[PDB]
């Protein structure tokens, strides 16, 4: 059962998405996006991406969802459609899981497989470095153009946000 950790995490990932997608109060919707983000980190970790996994925790959850919750606290006042939507999404996920395990194969737009995510992993790895770390670190040797446009857009974000919020 431990060999299907990624798939088990993938179900929790969807269930969290049905949580905040049914659009409960923003306080609880933001709680469902923190859980899904945490489960999203786990899936990336189990594919060999450790730096990418921790970026979600440090930036997506620690930096971006904090601002979403912080903004909700002061810019929001604080149903029978949230419950109906949530029930529909959970049933939709359950049927997919049943048919991807019972038959081991489902077809919705794309053709999926149910053997397990481990069957596609690479069988050869003997380097003395982390492959994703070398790729990410290459942003400074190769991604000169990426850095310039990315850094410029962050600077413009500061300029733009201050224009919008001045109010005069």
């Amino acid at each position: 059962m431990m060999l299907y950790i990624v798939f088990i995490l993938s179900v929790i990932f969807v269930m969290g998405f049905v949580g905040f997608s049914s659009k409960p109060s923003p306080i609880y919707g933001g709680l469902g996006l923190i859980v899904s983000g945490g489960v999203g980190c786990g899936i990336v970790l189990n594919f060999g991406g450790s730096f990418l996994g921790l970026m979600v925790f440090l930036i997506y959850l620690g930096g971006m969802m904090v601002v979403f919750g912080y903004t909700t606290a002061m810019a929001t006042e604080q149903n029978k459609a949230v419950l109906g939507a949530f029930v529909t999404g959970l049933l939709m996920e359950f049927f997919m899981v049943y048919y991807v395990l019972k038959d081991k194969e489902v077809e919705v737009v794309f053709e999926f497989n149910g053997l397990g995510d481990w069957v596609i992993y690479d069988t050869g790895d003997s380097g003395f470095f982390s492959e994703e770390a070398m790729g990410i670190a290459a942003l400074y040797s190769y991604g000169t153009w990426l850095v310039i446009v990315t850094g410029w857009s962050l600077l413009i974000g500061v300029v733009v946000i201050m224009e919008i919020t001045r109010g005069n």
Partner: protein, 98 residues
């Protein structure tokens, strides 16, 4: 590109990351590097209209390496038969497989 500034100026802006067969840090290869090299070399300079039918073998192999659809179906066939011969007590796996 709509405007091919990169080719005119001879400056590489984003072509370094367009394909997975390009130069990588520390010469780390991609899992489908060999297949992509063949498809890109088959369909070089003949256009997409010719390439869509003259390089279909290279692309189908490349598509198989990427998503492994035909590899997984064959394995799934092996496993279904194996389990059908064990619910009917008709197959004993060897010790090195158990």
């Amino acid at each position: 590109p709509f405007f091919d500034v990169q080719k005119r100026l001879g400056v590489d802006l984003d072509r370094w990351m367009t394909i997975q067969s390009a130069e990588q840090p520390h010469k780390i290869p991609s899992r489908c590097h060999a297949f992509e090299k063949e498809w890109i070399e088959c369909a070089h300079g003949i256009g997409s209209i010719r390439a869509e039918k003259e390089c279909k073998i290279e692309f189908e192999d490349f598509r198989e390496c990427l998503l492994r659809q035909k590899t997984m179906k064959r394995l799934h066939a092996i496993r279904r038969q194996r389990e059908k011969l064990i619910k009917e007590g008709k197959y004993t796996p060897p010790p090195h497989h158990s």
